[PDB]
Specification:
Distance between the termini: 19 Å
Membrane topology: Peripheral membrane protein
Order of helices and strands: EEHEEHEHEH
Number of helices: 4
Number of domains: 1
Protein name: Non-structural protein 3
Binding site for ADP-D-ribose: 13, 27, 35, 115-117
Radius of gyration: 14 Å
Subcellular location: Host cytoplasmic vesicle membrane
Structural class: alpha/beta
Strand content: 15-25%
Bound molecules: chloride ion
Domain Macro: 4-163
Strand order of the largest sheet: 1-6-5
Amino acid sequence: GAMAPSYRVKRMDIAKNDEECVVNAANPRGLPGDGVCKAVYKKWPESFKNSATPVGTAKTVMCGTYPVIHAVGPNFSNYTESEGDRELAAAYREVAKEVTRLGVNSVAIPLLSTGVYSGGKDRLTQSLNHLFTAMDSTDADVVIYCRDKEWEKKISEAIQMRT
Ligand SMILES: [Cl-]
Ligand SMILES: [Cl-]
Ligand SMILES: [Cl-]
């Protein structure tokens, strides 16, 4: 575990992370996809061997010795608000199990279901709170990656406000 487990946020490409493992915002079929999933495919393509996994689950595949945890958030275009919320909470609980199993001291994580799976809604607070519910009991250093300047400020404020 990390000596003083922390949350941090960075505004940059998660493909350039400085952590011991990465969470992919995957699709259920293990396809290259778009956004975070596409950048992960370009950086760790070997990790997409047998990566297909259902909504609300996480599956780790090693790229050399570097773990890629494929976490499948719901597409809120397809799910009701209620069922989507349950599956989004579940995907993050499976991330916490994988991070613990791997024994890593740090993990890079995107906000699941906030991009093209958001069903056109702002889900920063919803996705972040489910991330916290899952990861709070882990002792890894968590580094959240985002691309938008106003999302970086809002994530940073939510972190510091618990400290
Ligand atoms: Cl960048
Ligand atoms: Cl997404
Ligand atoms: Cl973002």
